[PDB]
Amino acid sequence: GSSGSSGMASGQFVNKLQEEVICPICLDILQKPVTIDCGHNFCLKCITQIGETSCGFFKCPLCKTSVRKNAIR
Ligand SMILES: [Zn+2]
Ligand SMILES: [Zn+2]
Numbered sequence: 001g002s003s004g005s006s007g008m009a010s011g012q013f014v015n016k017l018q019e020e021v022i023c024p025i026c027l028d029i030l031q032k033p034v035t036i037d038c039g040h041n042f043c044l045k046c047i048t049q050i051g052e053t054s055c056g057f058f059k060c061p062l063c064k065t066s067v068r069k070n071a072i073r
Contacts, residue, residue: 024062038065 021030023043033041038060051058057068 036060037067037070038063 018029021033021041022028023030023046024040025042025046028043028045030041030043032044034044034047035041036047040060040062047058050061059065060067
């Protein structure tokens, strides 16, 4: 029996303007913005996670609008 490891770094920070829409739920770069009937845009990681017990229809969190997943079958 024997082993060992060691490592250290610093890296560099970048100063740029990120004009990429963000999810108002998780607050993460919205990679896949889904504009539901209500309009608001959410991230798959969210819209999906939120749907645990429900079948598919879920009243938008931001606005209480009767929305029901519907699209070209
Ligand atoms: Zn999200
Ligand atoms: Zn909404």
